[PDB]
Amino acid sequence: XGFVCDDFPKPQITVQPETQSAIKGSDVSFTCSAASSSDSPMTFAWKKDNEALQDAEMENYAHLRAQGGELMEYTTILRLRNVEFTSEGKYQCVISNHFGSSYSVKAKLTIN
Amino acid sequence: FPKPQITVQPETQSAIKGSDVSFTCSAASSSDSPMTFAWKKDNEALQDAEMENYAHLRAQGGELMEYTTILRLRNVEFTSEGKYQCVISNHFGSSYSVKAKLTIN
Numbered sequence: 001x002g003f004v005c006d007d008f009p010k011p012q013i014t015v016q017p018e019t020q021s022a023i024k025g026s027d028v029s030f031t032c033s034a035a036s037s038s039d040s041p042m043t044f045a046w047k048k049d050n051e052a053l054q055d056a057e058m059e060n061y062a063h064l065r066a067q068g069g070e071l072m073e074y075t076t077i078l079r080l081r082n083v084e085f086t087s088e089g090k091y092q093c094v095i096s097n098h099f100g101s102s103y104s105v106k107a108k109l110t111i112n
Numbered sequence: 113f114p115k116p117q118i119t120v121q122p123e124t125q126s127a128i129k130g131s132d133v134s135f136t137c138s139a140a141s142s143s144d145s146p147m148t149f150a151w152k153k154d155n156e157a158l159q160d161a162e163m164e165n166y167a168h169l170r171a172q173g174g175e176l177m178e179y180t181t182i183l184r185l186r187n188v189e190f191t192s193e194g195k196y197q198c199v200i201s202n203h204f205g206s207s208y209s210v211k212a213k214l215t216i217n
């Protein structure tokens with residue numbers, strides 16, 4: 001889709017999470033942004049090594065009808081605090097609404 | 113946000129020889145400034161590319177400019193295979209889409 005028919009309701013990832021390194025005990029954040037032409041309930045999920053992070057601390061943002069236009073902008077920030085060697089793995093963001101789910105690139109986290 | 117912000121990325125596709133193929137890319141700007149839409153194949157400019165460019169200025173009476181560029185490829189040849197990229201720009205800056213691969217069978 002696009003703006004011609006204002007038909008991109010599925011989330012469109014615009015910012016990918018990035019592969020990072022962190023020291024044990026530090027705080028780590030992963031960010032993923034998306035856009036949509038639909039104002040529909042959104043769901044933000046994060047996974048580590050193909051498994052859901054059920055009690056993940058998140059900071060989710062929705063800018064609906066930005067500047068009075070027809071665009072929706074979203075950002076989800078995964079917050080990892082006091083990271084352990086067990087925090088190491090491939091992190092992935094899943095952004096979805098009832099039109100579809102969009103899967104981010106897998107961002108590797110290395111813990112030293 | 114005067115520089116264009118890509119909202120829809122072109123998608124990797126497969127097509128049969130002799131068919132028609134289209135790539136689409138959308139962007140938004142808070143600035144109603146002259147817009148340029150360009151498409152490249154394997155980092156090389158497509159100077160005579162057939163395009164359908166759309167500008168929805170002050171959409172719904174708001175202050176947002178919305179744009180879509182459609183690259184049109186007709187009667188694709190095996191030479192049409194490669195990584196396609198969209199560059200959307202105004203005098204504030206250029207935004208580069210992801211590279212979308214086209215496979216020709």
Ligand SMILES: [Cl-]
Nearest residue numbers: 017018030031
């Ligand atoms: Cl990140």
Ligand SMILES: [Cl-]
Nearest residue numbers: 122123135136
């Ligand atoms: Cl496309």
Ligand SMILES: [Cl-]
Nearest residue numbers: 153154155195
């Ligand atoms: Cl290339």
Ligand SMILES: [Cl-]
Nearest residue numbers: 115204205206
């Ligand atoms: Cl710059």
